[PDB]
Amino acid sequence: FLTAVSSIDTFLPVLNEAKLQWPTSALAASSEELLGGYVGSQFYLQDGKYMQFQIAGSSNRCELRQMIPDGGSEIGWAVDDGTTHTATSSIVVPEQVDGVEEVTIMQIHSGEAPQLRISWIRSKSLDGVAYEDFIMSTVRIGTGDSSDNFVKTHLADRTAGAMSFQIDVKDSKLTITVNGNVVVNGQDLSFWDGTDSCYFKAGAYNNNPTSESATARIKFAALAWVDHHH
Length: 230
Ligand SMILES: O=C(O)[C@H]1O[C@@H](O[C@H]2[C@H](O)[C@H](O)[C@H](O[C@H]3[C@H](O)[C@H](O)[C@@H](O)O[C@@H]3C(=O)O)O[C@@H]2C(=O)O)[C@@H](O)[C@@H](O)[C@@H]1O
Ligand SMILES: O=C(O)[C@H]1O[C@@H](O[C@H]2[C@H](O)[C@H](O)[C@H](O[C@H]3[C@H](O)[C@H](O)[C@H](O)O[C@@H]3C(=O)O)O[C@H]2C(=O)O)[C@@H](O)[C@@H](O)[C@@H]1O
Ligand SMILES: [Cl-]
Ligand SMILES: [Cl-]
Ligand SMILES: [Cl-]
Ligand SMILES: [Cl-]
Description:
By secondary structure, the chain is mainly β. The protein has helices at residues 12-15, 31-35; strands at residues 18-21, 27-29, 43-46, 50-56, 61-66, 85-92, 102-109, 114-126, 129-140, 150-157, 163-170, 173-178, 181-188, 199-207, 215-227. The chain has an eight-stranded antiparallel β-sheet. A seven-stranded antiparallel β-sheet has the order 3-4-15-6-11-12-13, with no helix packed on it.
């Protein structure tokens, strides 16, 4: 039988501050249900150690969505509210099966758009350089479809071992730290000033697969939203 993520202590803080969306953005498990042992092949404890997410299908997800703690409703914050908003993780991204092309593993999202996606991607060229099997950041600086609406950055080549991530937003600026090194330093998010519906997400969100049957799989060794106000 599949062991539940809540059976160890590692993820209890974030589970108290998240709902699980699966296989779409529909509710799969409330925070209370997650803390109460919700489990399935899409969301279970791997190796007694990893919160593992799995999903197949284009634009499908198995993803935690930040909630107000202690049974609260959906959170919404703003990049320019003056507070530092922080998400941390330690992620083992396994080799992805054929047909999986891009897996979003952390986000800042709002009511209408992704401000940031951190994603694994099989193969892509950025600013004239081809990259394979790597972790990328995609920041939106507008809602249009043309490339000038995005800033897309190679963060790191995928590693077999755990990779640490931290996302910080303060005063309309974004920093991303990977394995302890700042890779995105103060990216401008001021396009989003006044949008009060932002929130963190993390898990597996499957983008542009070439087979809808192919199952994306992502293992979290750690995940938290870090409250600077205590
Ligand atoms: O190599 C390129 O830069 C290609 O960029 C493509 O545009 C991307 C865009 O950068 C962004 O990644 C976007 O991401 C969407 C995501 O796939 C999901 O649909 C959902 O999360 O919404 C995201 C969003 O709309 O921000 O998807 C497109 C994409 O097609 O992958 C293209 O312009 C491509 O031609 C170009 O080579
Ligand atoms: O296009 C998507 O799939 C986006 O869905 C986003 O989640 C929304 C979405 O509306 C979803 O159905 C669900 O909506 C709830 C929620 O409680 C909401 O606050 C409302 O009051 O009730 C809705 C309901 O009854 O279904 O949750 C959403 C949310 O913001 O959490 C995100 O998953 C996006 O990332 C995604 O692009
Ligand atoms: Cl298990
Ligand atoms: Cl083990
Ligand atoms: Cl995999
Ligand atoms: Cl996140």
